[PDB]
Subunit: 249 residues, 3 copies
């Protein structure tokens, strides 16, 4: 015969679709009657088409009644290929899946603003704020005075160490000075310090530089100092050169 | 009847596909005649198949003439399920979409070579170049002399503070020295400095250490110094011990 | 006629599917006979359906015998549209492809725990361990004594520079002291040092502060020192004020 406008028949329960090898179309009206059968592509009421092209080729299609999908298969040399199941718009939408073209760094959302760094070295120049403390090998200040304070350092003494000169301890302000003066016999001579004492002279002394006669007085005196001058007294009966020292601040 | 080699008919305009409930196949020759109708799966000329399996099941397929897609649906207990639309090769190609297997760090393109780091601490040991300046709590040099210069520090004085000894200010080079010497009556005695002055002796003095007789001269003298020796003159009429001091550089 | 339960015929080799413009269904039993033909959707044995809707519309479907896929096309005004090829479950599974919803940072696998950082500055406060060495502008210690050692620094001298006072070099321990004392004529007077020498007095001297008569002895003496006192001898025949200096440690 031919394919008719009426279906060839209704599939009852327990139909093995492998046995439907005659051309036509058949309706399965009941999902449960599909469940109780065999080789249904999906447990679902549906429409089956059979095209028995030849003994060696039996083609079948199945349209699920609820649009679950549409299936097809074929029997080639007494072996049924598996049912193919169509993909349709009720399964998935491609727009929901990431294109390879949308897979790159700047497109990836949720990226942290900052990243936990690995082991890196720095140059000192990238220290741009803060003052390194002593506990870290620093000097705990950004001033010279403050640095010394942190590490208990003093300042350099200064001096001019000439034949007549001075020496100054800048930690405390102490100045010490020296010079020579020719004195008249049994008399005074004034000296002028190489530099002035900023505040006052605290003391001095004088010393006979010559091979004075040991049978007579050769005393010395340091007195009447100012910030700039002092009086050296020579107790030797001849004119003589006396050296002196003086200190102050 | 049966499905014929000729189509059952041409669909004109204004056809509600819900009304095509008789088995057969019908052609819509004009996209616009689909537009003017109802329940077409797509506004597009196409081929419609109707399989009226039973009163309760009416199956339909629609093949768009331009291959837009292929559609199917069914009427179950007087309600039409929605049209299913097939996915085909003209819609998309899976090769353009990212597999889950190709979603990992090393595959992600456009990754920066370096990343903005978050708050991290360092150990000092990862400072491997540069010289920390004073403005940062550093000493602004990698030399001892250069460090002191930055912070205005002096160097330690050195000394040997024995009964006879010396003291040296290494900031300026000033050396001061002391000792004792037994002198003959009314005569000279030579002393040798604990260390030699590197350059010259700048001055000295001597002092009577004994309870000399106050009814006679007991003068002192320091003279004729070299880098290593000096002459101490004793103006007392007895042999006596005189202490001395001397300074230089 | 009508579509029959028997296929209209077997397609031999060398069939141009463009020529199959009569309604019916035909079977290609041999993949190689498809290879030797034209306009087959796939080189594969299969079932062909032709629906000659009208002169202007010829619809075709092709079901591959091995389920490779299912194809359809149409001839509109003497031009064949391309074959559409169905996507099915044997081609791909959507579950293997990444959803846009699963494309974010925390989902991306294989992320490194740490990231190579870019150029950043630090505040000194994020140095939280280690001691900066001199080679980096540090002081190579976390102690004051150790810092000075690294950079060769000395400590501050201390002093009290009053009319009678003292000065101490704390690098070496040397103390120097000064004062004045009224002495009886031709006699001794005891002095007490402004501070005690911690260990011993190493030396001293005295100096006549007055305009003594140059026709008589005005000698001086420093002797018998302890840590706290000394004896100043005045060789002048009048009572007189003598200044002194003393040093020790
Ligand atoms: Mg004499
Ligand atoms: Mg006398
Ligand atoms: Mg005299
Ligand atoms: Ni860092």
């Amino acid at each position: 015969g031919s394919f008719t406008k009426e279906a060839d028949g209704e599939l009852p329960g327990g139909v093995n679709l492998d046995s439907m090898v005659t051309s036509g179309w058949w309706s399965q009206s009941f999902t449960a009657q599909a469940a109780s059968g065999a080789n249904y592509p999906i447990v679902r009421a549906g429409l089956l088409h059979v095209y028995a092209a030849s003994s060696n080729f039996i083609y079948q299609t199945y349209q699920a009644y609820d649009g679950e999908s549409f299936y097809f298969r074929c029997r080639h040399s007494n072996t049924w290929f598996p049912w193919r199941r169509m993909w349709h718009g009720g399964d998935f939408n491609p727009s929901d899946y990431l294109l390879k073209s949308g897979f790159y760094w700047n497109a990836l959302p949720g990226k942290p603003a900052t990243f936990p760094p690995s082991a890196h070295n720095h140059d000192v120049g990238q220290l741009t704020s803060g003052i390194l403390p002593l506990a870290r090998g620093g000097v705990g200040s950004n001033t010279a005075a403050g640095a010394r304070s942190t590490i208990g350092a003093g300042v350099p003494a200064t001096a001019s160490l000439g034949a007549s000169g001075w020496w100054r301890d800048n930690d405390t302000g102490l100045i010490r000075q020296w010079g020579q003066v020719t004195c008249p016999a049994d008399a005074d001579a004034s000296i002028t310090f190489p530099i002035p004492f900023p505040t006052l002279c605290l003391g001095g002394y004088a010393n006979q530089t010559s091979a004075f006669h040991p049978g007579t007085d050769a005393s010395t005196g340091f007195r009447g100092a100012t910030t700039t001058t002092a009086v050296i007294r020579n107790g030797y009966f001849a004119q003589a050169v006396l050296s002196w020292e003086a200190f102050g601040r």
